[PDB]
């Protein structure tokens, strides 16, 4: 008569307990070792030759490198296009302008804002959020459909008269992610989400919150703000609605690391969520301690 693995497992028990930090020393967690584990019986060998360690840390540096170098590429584009235009900024965001103002001080505030924003660069910044939907599977199909739809001949009278109605075009309401930096007190905001639209009277942009209220910062002298489109187009704005235009040259990075760092992770079915795609999820499962657990 023999016992199962479970009973000898529980009898043998554990005897060791160690605490290990992550690489960045952000979080610490413990590990348990079971004396009866098959891992002991295998008798595998272990070594940590220093060249492999050096390669590992260099690769890790290259891994955390993905977003800071993208920020620096944004810097390089800003400066390069500022030089190329030669110090001329067309107005792009709808706001009135005053002539009898010391524009030198707001130029200096733009310099200070550019300096301050870069010091506080982080993965939380706007452009990471901009790439976030670009990587997902739906983005490629949506871009293909959009390019096919926009590159279309005007329908003949025949198609308009009979059959399907005019096929729906793109909406004016665009979604942007933004960084805003205030110079009067040195502090930055980096994870903003904002609604955008094109003004009907003049082709300039209007910025609004997701609640619909019209946004105020564009007037404030002490603030300079950063925009990026969902098709990775780039804007930098200083007070007065005068903007700098470029495209984010993300080609400096390998696709492998870029996908490794971040993506909008797709889910798989678990208890409670619908089998049909896109249905409204019921109340969250939430195994809880505030209440006596259900059985």
């Amino acid at each position: 008569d023999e016992v199962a693995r479970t009973d000898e497992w529980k009898g043998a028990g554990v005897s060791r307990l160690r605490e290990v930090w992550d690489v960045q020393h952000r979080v610490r967690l413990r590990v348990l070792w079971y004396v009866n584990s098959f891992w002991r019986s295998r008798e595998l060998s272990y070594d940590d030759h220093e060249v492999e360690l050096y390669r590992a840390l260099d690769a890790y540096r290259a891994r955390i490198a993905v977003e800071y170098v993208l920020i620096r590429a944004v810097r390089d584009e800003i400066y390069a296009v500022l030089r190329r235009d030669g110090g001329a900024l067309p107005q792009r965001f709808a706001c009135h302008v005053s002539r009898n103002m010391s524009w030198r001080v707001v130029w200096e505030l733009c310099r200070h804002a550019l300096a301050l924003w870069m010091d506080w660069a982080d993965v939380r910044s706007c452009i990471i959020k901009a790439l976030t939907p670009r990587l997902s599977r739906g983005a490629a199909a949506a871009a293909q459909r959009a390019r096919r739809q926009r590159e279309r001949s005007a329908p003949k009278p025949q198609e308009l008269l009979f059959g399907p109605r005019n096929e729906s075009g793109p909406p004016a309401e665009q979604t942007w992610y933004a960084d805003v930096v205030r110079c009067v007190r040195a502090q930055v905001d980096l994870g903003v989400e904002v609604r955008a639209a094109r003004c009907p009277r003049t082709g300039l942009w209007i910025v609004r919150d997701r609640r619909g209220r019209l946004r105020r910062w564009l007037s404030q002298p002490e603030v300079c703000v950063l925009y990026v489109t969902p098709d990775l187009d780039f804007y930098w704005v200083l007070p007065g609605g005068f903007a700098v235009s470029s495209r984010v040259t993300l080609h400096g990075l390998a696709q492998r690391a870029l996908r490794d760092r971040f993506q909008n992770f797709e889910a798989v079915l678990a208890r409670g969520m619908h089998v049909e795609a896109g249905r409204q999820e019921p109340e969250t499962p939430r195994v809880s301690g505030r209440r006596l657990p259900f059985d």
Partner: protein
């Protein structure tokens, strides 16, 4: 090693249990004050 013993004055019992179930693979607990 032993906490309480009848007439004298259990980590040992459970530790012997774990070692002996590791050896035997059978559940026959032999306590310090139970068997001879």
């Amino acid at each position: 090693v032993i906490q309480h013993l009848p007439g004298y004055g259990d980590v040992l019992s459970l530790w012997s249990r774990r070692l002996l179930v590791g050896k035997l693979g059978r559940d026959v607990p032999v306590f310090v004050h139970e068997q001879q």
